[PDB]
PDB file of all heavy atoms in Angstrom:
ATOM      1  N   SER A  14      38.862   0.363  38.679  1.00  0.00           N
ATOM      2  CA  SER A  14      39.959  -0.578  38.909  1.00  0.00           C
ATOM      3  C   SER A  14      41.174   0.223  39.366  1.00  0.00           C
ATOM      4  O   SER A  14      41.818   0.900  38.558  1.00  0.00           O
ATOM      5  CB  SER A  14      40.265  -1.387  37.655  1.00  0.00           C
ATOM      6  OG  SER A  14      39.166  -2.207  37.295  1.00  0.00           O
ATOM      7  N   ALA A  15      41.484   0.142  40.655  1.00  0.00           N
ATOM      8  CA  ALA A  15      42.628   0.841  41.219  1.00  0.00           C
ATOM      9  C   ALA A  15      43.891   0.000  41.074  1.00  0.00           C
ATOM     10  O   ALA A  15      43.842  -1.232  41.046  1.00  0.00           O
ATOM     11  CB  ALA A  15      42.390   1.173  42.693  1.00  0.00           C
ATOM     12  N   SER A  16      45.029   0.684  40.981  1.00  0.00           N
ATOM     13  CA  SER A  16      46.310   0.015  40.821  1.00  0.00           C
ATOM     14  C   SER A  16      47.423   0.946  41.281  1.00  0.00           C
ATOM     15  O   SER A  16      47.254   2.166  41.344  1.00  0.00           O
ATOM     16  CB  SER A  16      46.542  -0.418  39.368  1.00  0.00           C
ATOM     17  OG  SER A  16      46.650   0.706  38.513  1.00  0.00           O
ATOM     18  N   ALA A  17      48.569   0.348  41.604  1.00  0.00           N
ATOM     19  CA  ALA A  17      49.736   1.107  42.035  1.00  0.00           C
ATOM     20  C   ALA A  17      50.915   0.845  41.108  1.00  0.00           C
ATOM     21  O   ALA A  17      50.728   0.453  39.952  1.00  0.00           O
ATOM     22  CB  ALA A  17      50.102   0.758  43.479  1.00  0.00           C
ATOM     23  N   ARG A  18      52.134   1.058  41.605  1.00  0.00           N
ATOM     24  CA  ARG A  18      53.328   0.826  40.801  1.00  0.00           C
ATOM     25  C   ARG A  18      54.521   0.491  41.688  1.00  0.00           C
ATOM     26  O   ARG A  18      54.732  -0.674  42.040  1.00  0.00           O
ATOM     27  CB  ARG A  18      53.633   2.046  39.929  1.00  0.00           C
ATOM     28  CG  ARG A  18      54.692   1.802  38.865  1.00  0.00           C
ATOM     29  CD  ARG A  18      54.899   3.034  37.998  1.00  0.00           C
ATOM     30  NE  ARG A  18      53.710   3.357  37.216  1.00  0.00           N
ATOM     31  CZ  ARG A  18      53.413   2.808  36.043  1.00  0.00           C
ATOM     32  NH1 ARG A  18      54.223   1.903  35.508  1.00  0.00           N
ATOM     33  NH2 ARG A  18      52.308   3.163  35.402  1.00  0.00           N
ATOM     34  N   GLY A  19      55.303   1.503  42.058  1.00  0.00           N
ATOM     35  CA  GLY A  19      56.484   1.287  42.869  1.00  0.00           C
ATOM     36  C   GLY A  19      57.576   0.540  42.131  1.00  0.00           C
ATOM     37  O   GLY A  19      57.810  -0.645  42.388  1.00  0.00           O
ATOM     38  N   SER A  20      58.250   1.223  41.210  1.00  0.00           N
ATOM     39  CA  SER A  20      59.290   0.594  40.412  1.00  0.00           C
ATOM     40  C   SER A  20      60.598   0.532  41.201  1.00  0.00           C
ATOM     41  O   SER A  20      60.693   0.982  42.347  1.00  0.00           O
ATOM     42  CB  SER A  20      59.478   1.347  39.098  1.00  0.00           C
ATOM     43  OG  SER A  20      58.309   1.276  38.299  1.00  0.00           O
ATOM     44  N   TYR A  21      61.621  -0.045  40.565  1.00  0.00           N
ATOM     45  CA  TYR A  21      62.952  -0.188  41.145  1.00  0.00           C
ATOM     46  C   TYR A  21      62.905  -0.941  42.470  1.00  0.00           C
ATOM     47  O   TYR A  21      62.972  -0.330  43.542  1.00  0.00           O
ATOM     48  CB  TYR A  21      63.608   1.184  41.333  1.00  0.00           C
ATOM     49  CG  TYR A  21      64.006   1.858  40.038  1.00  0.00           C
ATOM     50  CD1 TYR A  21      64.296   3.216  40.000  1.00  0.00           C
ATOM     51  CD2 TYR A  21      64.090   1.137  38.854  1.00  0.00           C
ATOM     52  CE1 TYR A  21      64.659   3.836  38.818  1.00  0.00           C
ATOM     53  CE2 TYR A  21      64.452   1.748  37.669  1.00  0.00           C
ATOM     54  CZ  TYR A  21      64.736   3.098  37.656  1.00  0.00           C
ATOM     55  OH  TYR A  21      65.097   3.710  36.478  1.00  0.00           O
ATOM     56  N   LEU A  22      62.793  -2.265  42.405  1.00  0.00           N
ATOM     57  CA  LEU A  22      62.747  -3.114  43.590  1.00  0.00           C
ATOM     58  C   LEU A  22      63.787  -4.213  43.443  1.00  0.00           C
ATOM     59  O   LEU A  22      63.741  -4.989  42.482  1.00  0.00           O
ATOM     60  CB  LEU A  22      61.352  -3.714  43.788  1.00  0.00           C
ATOM     61  CG  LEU A  22      60.230  -2.725  44.109  1.00  0.00           C
ATOM     62  CD1 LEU A  22      58.883  -3.431  44.144  1.00  0.00           C
ATOM     63  CD2 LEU A  22      60.501  -2.013  45.426  1.00  0.00           C
ATOM     64  N   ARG A  23      64.721  -4.279  44.393  1.00  0.00           N
ATOM     65  CA  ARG A  23      65.791  -5.277  44.368  1.00  0.00           C
ATOM     66  C   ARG A  23      65.331  -6.502  45.154  1.00  0.00           C
ATOM     67  O   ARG A  23      65.680  -6.708  46.318  1.00  0.00           O
ATOM     68  CB  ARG A  23      67.080  -4.694  44.932  1.00  0.00           C
ATOM     69  CG  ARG A  23      68.301  -5.580  44.745  1.00  0.00           C
ATOM     70  CD  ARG A  23      69.522  -4.985  45.427  1.00  0.00           C
ATOM     71  NE  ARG A  23      69.882  -3.683  44.872  1.00  0.00           N
ATOM     72  CZ  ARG A  23      70.648  -3.514  43.799  1.00  0.00           C
ATOM     73  NH1 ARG A  23      71.142  -4.567  43.161  1.00  0.00           N
ATOM     74  NH2 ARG A  23      70.922  -2.292  43.365  1.00  0.00           N
ATOM     75  N   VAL A  24      64.524  -7.330  44.492  1.00  0.00           N
ATOM     76  CA  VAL A  24      63.997  -8.543  45.110  1.00  0.00           C
ATOM     77  C   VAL A  24      64.497  -9.750  44.326  1.00  0.00           C
ATOM     78  O   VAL A  24      65.685 -10.088  44.375  1.00  0.00           O
ATOM     79  CB  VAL A  24      62.458  -8.515  45.175  1.00  0.00           C
ATOM     80  CG1 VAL A  24      61.940  -9.553  46.168  1.00  0.00           C
ATOM     81  CG2 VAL A  24      61.963  -7.123  45.539  1.00  0.00           C
ATOM     82  N   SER A  25      63.594 -10.401  43.590  1.00  0.00           N
ATOM     83  CA  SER A  25      63.932 -11.578  42.799  1.00  0.00           C
ATOM     84  C   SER A  25      62.801 -11.904  41.831  1.00  0.00           C
ATOM     85  O   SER A  25      61.637 -11.981  42.235  1.00  0.00           O
ATOM     86  CB  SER A  25      64.216 -12.777  43.705  1.00  0.00           C
ATOM     87  OG  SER A  25      64.513 -13.934  42.942  1.00  0.00           O
ATOM     88  N   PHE A  26      63.134 -12.098  40.553  1.00  0.00           N
ATOM     89  CA  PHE A  26      62.106 -12.379  39.556  1.00  0.00           C
ATOM     90  C   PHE A  26      61.415 -13.710  39.831  1.00  0.00           C
ATOM     91  O   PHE A  26      60.183 -13.803  39.767  1.00  0.00           O
ATOM     92  CB  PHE A  26      62.718 -12.370  38.156  1.00  0.00           C
ATOM     93  CG  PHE A  26      61.722 -12.606  37.056  1.00  0.00           C
ATOM     94  CD1 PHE A  26      60.853 -11.601  36.663  1.00  0.00           C
ATOM     95  CD2 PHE A  26      61.657 -13.831  36.413  1.00  0.00           C
ATOM     96  CE1 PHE A  26      59.936 -11.815  35.652  1.00  0.00           C
ATOM     97  CE2 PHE A  26      60.741 -14.052  35.401  1.00  0.00           C
ATOM     98  CZ  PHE A  26      59.880 -13.042  35.019  1.00  0.00           C
ATOM     99  N   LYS A  27      62.194 -14.748  40.147  1.00  0.00           N
ATOM    100  CA  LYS A  27      61.616 -16.068  40.382  1.00  0.00           C
ATOM    101  C   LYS A  27      60.707 -16.080  41.603  1.00  0.00           C
ATOM    102  O   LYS A  27      59.777 -16.891  41.675  1.00  0.00           O
ATOM    103  CB  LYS A  27      62.729 -17.106  40.541  1.00  0.00           C
ATOM    104  CG  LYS A  27      63.549 -17.338  39.283  1.00  0.00           C
ATOM    105  CD  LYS A  27      64.626 -18.385  39.512  1.00  0.00           C
ATOM    106  CE  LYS A  27      65.473 -18.589  38.266  1.00  0.00           C
ATOM    107  NZ  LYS A  27      66.538 -19.607  38.478  1.00  0.00           N
ATOM    108  N   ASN A  28      60.956 -15.194  42.569  1.00  0.00           N
ATOM    109  CA  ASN A  28      60.108 -15.135  43.754  1.00  0.00           C
ATOM    110  C   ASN A  28      58.898 -14.236  43.534  1.00  0.00           C
ATOM    111  O   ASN A  28      57.780 -14.589  43.930  1.00  0.00           O
ATOM    112  CB  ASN A  28      60.919 -14.652  44.958  1.00  0.00           C
ATOM    113  CG  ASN A  28      61.920 -15.684  45.439  1.00  0.00           C
ATOM    114  OD1 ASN A  28      61.619 -16.877  45.498  1.00  0.00           O
ATOM    115  ND2 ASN A  28      63.117 -15.230  45.788  1.00  0.00           N
ATOM    116  N   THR A  29      59.100 -13.077  42.902  1.00  0.00           N
ATOM    117  CA  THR A  29      57.991 -12.156  42.668  1.00  0.00           C
ATOM    118  C   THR A  29      56.967 -12.757  41.713  1.00  0.00           C
ATOM    119  O   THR A  29      55.758 -12.682  41.960  1.00  0.00           O
ATOM    120  CB  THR A  29      58.511 -10.822  42.129  1.00  0.00           C
ATOM    121  OG1 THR A  29      59.365 -11.056  41.003  1.00  0.00           O
ATOM    122  CG2 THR A  29      59.281 -10.070  43.209  1.00  0.00           C
ATOM    123  N   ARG A  30      57.430 -13.361  40.615  1.00  0.00           N
ATOM    124  CA  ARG A  30      56.500 -13.984  39.678  1.00  0.00           C
ATOM    125  C   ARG A  30      55.738 -15.125  40.341  1.00  0.00           C
ATOM    126  O   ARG A  30      54.529 -15.284  40.125  1.00  0.00           O
ATOM    127  CB  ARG A  30      57.253 -14.482  38.443  1.00  0.00           C
ATOM    128  CG  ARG A  30      56.354 -14.900  37.286  1.00  0.00           C
ATOM    129  CD  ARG A  30      56.129 -16.405  37.258  1.00  0.00           C
ATOM    130  NE  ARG A  30      55.314 -16.816  36.119  1.00  0.00           N
ATOM    131  CZ  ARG A  30      54.801 -18.032  35.967  1.00  0.00           C
ATOM    132  NH1 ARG A  30      55.018 -18.965  36.885  1.00  0.00           N
ATOM    133  NH2 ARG A  30      54.071 -18.317  34.898  1.00  0.00           N
ATOM    134  N   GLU A  31      56.424 -15.919  41.165  1.00  0.00           N
ATOM    135  CA  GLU A  31      55.767 -17.047  41.816  1.00  0.00           C
ATOM    136  C   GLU A  31      54.722 -16.577  42.819  1.00  0.00           C
ATOM    137  O   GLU A  31      53.606 -17.109  42.854  1.00  0.00           O
ATOM    138  CB  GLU A  31      56.802 -17.941  42.496  1.00  0.00           C
ATOM    139  CG  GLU A  31      56.237 -19.261  42.995  1.00  0.00           C
ATOM    140  CD  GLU A  31      55.786 -20.164  41.862  1.00  0.00           C
ATOM    141  OE1 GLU A  31      56.386 -20.093  40.768  1.00  0.00           O
ATOM    142  OE2 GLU A  31      54.826 -20.937  42.061  1.00  0.00           O
ATOM    143  N   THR A  32      55.054 -15.574  43.640  1.00  0.00           N
ATOM    144  CA  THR A  32      54.078 -15.087  44.608  1.00  0.00           C
ATOM    145  C   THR A  32      52.934 -14.344  43.926  1.00  0.00           C
ATOM    146  O   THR A  32      51.814 -14.325  44.449  1.00  0.00           O
ATOM    147  CB  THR A  32      54.754 -14.199  45.658  1.00  0.00           C
ATOM    148  OG1 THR A  32      53.835 -13.935  46.725  1.00  0.00           O
ATOM    149  CG2 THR A  32      55.210 -12.880  45.058  1.00  0.00           C
ATOM    150  N   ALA A  33      53.180 -13.756  42.751  1.00  0.00           N
ATOM    151  CA  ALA A  33      52.097 -13.119  42.010  1.00  0.00           C
ATOM    152  C   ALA A  33      51.161 -14.156  41.406  1.00  0.00           C
ATOM    153  O   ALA A  33      49.938 -13.969  41.399  1.00  0.00           O
ATOM    154  CB  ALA A  33      52.668 -12.209  40.923  1.00  0.00           C
ATOM    155  N   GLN A  34      51.715 -15.256  40.891  1.00  0.00           N
ATOM    156  CA  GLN A  34      50.873 -16.329  40.373  1.00  0.00           C
ATOM    157  C   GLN A  34      50.133 -17.051  41.492  1.00  0.00           C
ATOM    158  O   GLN A  34      49.039 -17.581  41.270  1.00  0.00           O
ATOM    159  CB  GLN A  34      51.713 -17.319  39.566  1.00  0.00           C
ATOM    160  CG  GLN A  34      52.271 -16.749  38.271  1.00  0.00           C
ATOM    161  CD  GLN A  34      51.182 -16.342  37.298  1.00  0.00           C
ATOM    162  OE1 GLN A  34      50.959 -15.155  37.060  1.00  0.00           O
ATOM    163  NE2 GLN A  34      50.498 -17.328  36.729  1.00  0.00           N
ATOM    164  N   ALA A  35      50.711 -17.084  42.695  1.00  0.00           N
ATOM    165  CA  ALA A  35      50.048 -17.739  43.818  1.00  0.00           C
ATOM    166  C   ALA A  35      48.945 -16.869  44.409  1.00  0.00           C
ATOM    167  O   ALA A  35      47.871 -17.375  44.753  1.00  0.00           O
ATOM    168  CB  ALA A  35      51.074 -18.103  44.892  1.00  0.00           C
ATOM    169  N   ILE A  36      49.188 -15.562  44.537  1.00  0.00           N
ATOM    170  CA  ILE A  36      48.181 -14.674  45.105  1.00  0.00           C
ATOM    171  C   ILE A  36      47.043 -14.399  44.128  1.00  0.00           C
ATOM    172  O   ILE A  36      45.971 -13.946  44.550  1.00  0.00           O
ATOM    173  CB  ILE A  36      48.828 -13.354  45.563  1.00  0.00           C
ATOM    174  CG1 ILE A  36      47.938 -12.639  46.583  1.00  0.00           C
ATOM    175  CG2 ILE A  36      49.109 -12.449  44.371  1.00  0.00           C
ATOM    176  CD1 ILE A  36      48.633 -11.511  47.315  1.00  0.00           C
ATOM    177  N   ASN A  37      47.239 -14.670  42.841  1.00  0.00           N
ATOM    178  CA  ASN A  37      46.197 -14.417  41.856  1.00  0.00           C
ATOM    179  C   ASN A  37      45.049 -15.406  42.023  1.00  0.00           C
ATOM    180  O   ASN A  37      45.262 -16.592  42.294  1.00  0.00           O
ATOM    181  CB  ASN A  37      46.771 -14.510  40.442  1.00  0.00           C
ATOM    182  CG  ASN A  37      45.828 -13.954  39.390  1.00  0.00           C
ATOM    183  OD1 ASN A  37      44.737 -13.481  39.704  1.00  0.00           O
ATOM    184  ND2 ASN A  37      46.249 -14.011  38.132  1.00  0.00           N
ATOM    185  N   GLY A  38      43.825 -14.909  41.859  1.00  0.00           N
ATOM    186  CA  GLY A  38      42.641 -15.729  41.983  1.00  0.00           C
ATOM    187  C   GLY A  38      41.975 -15.705  43.340  1.00  0.00           C
ATOM    188  O   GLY A  38      40.963 -16.394  43.527  1.00  0.00           O
ATOM    189  N   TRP A  39      42.503 -14.940  44.292  1.00  0.00           N
ATOM    190  CA  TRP A  39      41.942 -14.851  45.631  1.00  0.00           C
ATOM    191  C   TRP A  39      41.471 -13.430  45.906  1.00  0.00           C
ATOM    192  O   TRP A  39      41.875 -12.475  45.236  1.00  0.00           O
ATOM    193  CB  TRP A  39      42.967 -15.280  46.692  1.00  0.00           C
ATOM    194  CG  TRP A  39      43.272 -16.747  46.671  1.00  0.00           C
ATOM    195  CD1 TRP A  39      42.628 -17.708  45.947  1.00  0.00           C
ATOM    196  CD2 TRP A  39      44.301 -17.421  47.406  1.00  0.00           C
ATOM    197  NE1 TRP A  39      43.191 -18.939  46.187  1.00  0.00           N
ATOM    198  CE2 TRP A  39      44.220 -18.790  47.079  1.00  0.00           C
ATOM    199  CE3 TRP A  39      45.282 -17.000  48.309  1.00  0.00           C
ATOM    200  CZ2 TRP A  39      45.082 -19.739  47.623  1.00  0.00           C
ATOM    201  CZ3 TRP A  39      46.137 -17.945  48.848  1.00  0.00           C
ATOM    202  CH2 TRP A  39      46.031 -19.299  48.503  1.00  0.00           C
ATOM    203  N   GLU A  40      40.605 -13.301  46.907  1.00  0.00           N
ATOM    204  CA  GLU A  40      40.056 -12.007  47.276  1.00  0.00           C
ATOM    205  C   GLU A  40      41.091 -11.181  48.037  1.00  0.00           C
ATOM    206  O   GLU A  40      42.124 -11.683  48.489  1.00  0.00           O
ATOM    207  CB  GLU A  40      38.791 -12.182  48.115  1.00  0.00           C
ATOM    208  CG  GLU A  40      37.622 -12.791  47.357  1.00  0.00           C
ATOM    209  CD  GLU A  40      36.395 -12.971  48.228  1.00  0.00           C
ATOM    210  OE1 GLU A  40      36.492 -12.738  49.451  1.00  0.00           O
ATOM    211  OE2 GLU A  40      35.332 -13.347  47.689  1.00  0.00           O
ATOM    212  N   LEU A  41      40.798  -9.886  48.178  1.00  0.00           N
ATOM    213  CA  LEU A  41      41.708  -8.994  48.889  1.00  0.00           C
ATOM    214  C   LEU A  41      41.693  -9.272  50.387  1.00  0.00           C
ATOM    215  O   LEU A  41      42.753  -9.330  51.025  1.00  0.00           O
ATOM    216  CB  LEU A  41      41.341  -7.537  48.600  1.00  0.00           C
ATOM    217  CG  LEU A  41      42.298  -6.442  49.077  1.00  0.00           C
ATOM    218  CD1 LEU A  41      42.374  -5.326  48.049  1.00  0.00           C
ATOM    219  CD2 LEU A  41      41.857  -5.888  50.424  1.00  0.00           C
ATOM    220  N   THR A  42      40.502  -9.446  50.968  1.00  0.00           N
ATOM    221  CA  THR A  42      40.402  -9.756  52.389  1.00  0.00           C
ATOM    222  C   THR A  42      40.998 -11.116  52.726  1.00  0.00           C
ATOM    223  O   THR A  42      41.376 -11.343  53.880  1.00  0.00           O
ATOM    224  CB  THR A  42      38.941  -9.696  52.843  1.00  0.00           C
ATOM    225  OG1 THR A  42      38.868  -9.917  54.258  1.00  0.00           O
ATOM    226  CG2 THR A  42      38.107 -10.748  52.124  1.00  0.00           C
ATOM    227  N   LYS A  43      41.090 -12.020  51.751  1.00  0.00           N
ATOM    228  CA  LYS A  43      41.752 -13.301  51.959  1.00  0.00           C
ATOM    229  C   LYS A  43      43.248 -13.226  51.697  1.00  0.00           C
ATOM    230  O   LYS A  43      44.023 -13.919  52.366  1.00  0.00           O
ATOM    231  CB  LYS A  43      41.125 -14.371  51.061  1.00  0.00           C
ATOM    232  CG  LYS A  43      39.699 -14.738  51.436  1.00  0.00           C
ATOM    233  CD  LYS A  43      39.114 -15.748  50.462  1.00  0.00           C
ATOM    234  CE  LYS A  43      39.757 -17.115  50.631  1.00  0.00           C
ATOM    235  NZ  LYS A  43      39.404 -17.736  51.936  1.00  0.00           N
ATOM    236  N   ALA A  44      43.672 -12.397  50.739  1.00  0.00           N
ATOM    237  CA  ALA A  44      45.098 -12.231  50.484  1.00  0.00           C
ATOM    238  C   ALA A  44      45.787 -11.487  51.620  1.00  0.00           C
ATOM    239  O   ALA A  44      46.963 -11.742  51.903  1.00  0.00           O
ATOM    240  CB  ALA A  44      45.317 -11.500  49.160  1.00  0.00           C
ATOM    241  N   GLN A  45      45.079 -10.568  52.281  1.00  0.00           N
ATOM    242  CA  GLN A  45      45.660  -9.870  53.422  1.00  0.00           C
ATOM    243  C   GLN A  45      45.849 -10.784  54.625  1.00  0.00           C
ATOM    244  O   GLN A  45      46.719 -10.515  55.460  1.00  0.00           O
ATOM    245  CB  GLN A  45      44.791  -8.671  53.812  1.00  0.00           C
ATOM    246  CG  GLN A  45      44.898  -7.490  52.862  1.00  0.00           C
ATOM    247  CD  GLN A  45      44.091  -6.295  53.329  1.00  0.00           C
ATOM    248  OE1 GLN A  45      43.343  -6.379  54.302  1.00  0.00           O
ATOM    249  NE2 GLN A  45      44.247  -5.171  52.640  1.00  0.00           N
ATOM    250  N   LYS A  46      45.059 -11.852  54.733  1.00  0.00           N
ATOM    251  CA  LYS A  46      45.200 -12.797  55.833  1.00  0.00           C
ATOM    252  C   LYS A  46      46.095 -13.979  55.491  1.00  0.00           C
ATOM    253  O   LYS A  46      46.666 -14.590  56.402  1.00  0.00           O
ATOM    254  CB  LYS A  46      43.824 -13.315  56.267  1.00  0.00           C
ATOM    255  CG  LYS A  46      42.936 -12.261  56.907  1.00  0.00           C
ATOM    256  CD  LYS A  46      41.688 -12.883  57.512  1.00  0.00           C
ATOM    257  CE  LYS A  46      40.708 -13.317  56.435  1.00  0.00           C
ATOM    258  NZ  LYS A  46      39.435 -13.830  57.015  1.00  0.00           N
ATOM    259  N   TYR A  47      46.231 -14.318  54.206  1.00  0.00           N
ATOM    260  CA  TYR A  47      47.090 -15.433  53.825  1.00  0.00           C
ATOM    261  C   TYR A  47      48.565 -15.084  53.968  1.00  0.00           C
ATOM    262  O   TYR A  47      49.383 -15.964  54.263  1.00  0.00           O
ATOM    263  CB  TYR A  47      46.784 -15.865  52.390  1.00  0.00           C
ATOM    264  CG  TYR A  47      47.635 -17.014  51.901  1.00  0.00           C
ATOM    265  CD1 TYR A  47      47.403 -18.312  52.338  1.00  0.00           C
ATOM    266  CD2 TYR A  47      48.671 -16.802  51.001  1.00  0.00           C
ATOM    267  CE1 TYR A  47      48.179 -19.365  51.894  1.00  0.00           C
ATOM    268  CE2 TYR A  47      49.452 -17.849  50.550  1.00  0.00           C
ATOM    269  CZ  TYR A  47      49.202 -19.130  51.001  1.00  0.00           C
ATOM    270  OH  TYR A  47      49.977 -20.175  50.555  1.00  0.00           O
TER     271      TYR A  47
END
């Protein structure tokens, strides 16, 4: 199980959490195209 990190990101919690919950449950080859 590979994973990354990349801390210190000035984005938005409400947007990052939402896009993480939306991208969850899909394949990598499908997430790269969505």
Side-chain angles (χ1 to χ4, degrees):
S14 296
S16 65
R18 191 177 295 275
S20 296
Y21 290 164
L22 294 174
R23 189 184 298 275
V24 197
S25 179
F26 182 76
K27 294 180 182 180
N28 289 319
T29 52
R30 191 263 182 191
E31 190 66 31
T32 190
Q34 292 297 109
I36 200 167
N37 193 1
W39 290 351
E40 293 179 353
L41 189 142
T42 184
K43 292 177 71 68
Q45 286 184 353
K46 293 189 287 185
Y47 180 75

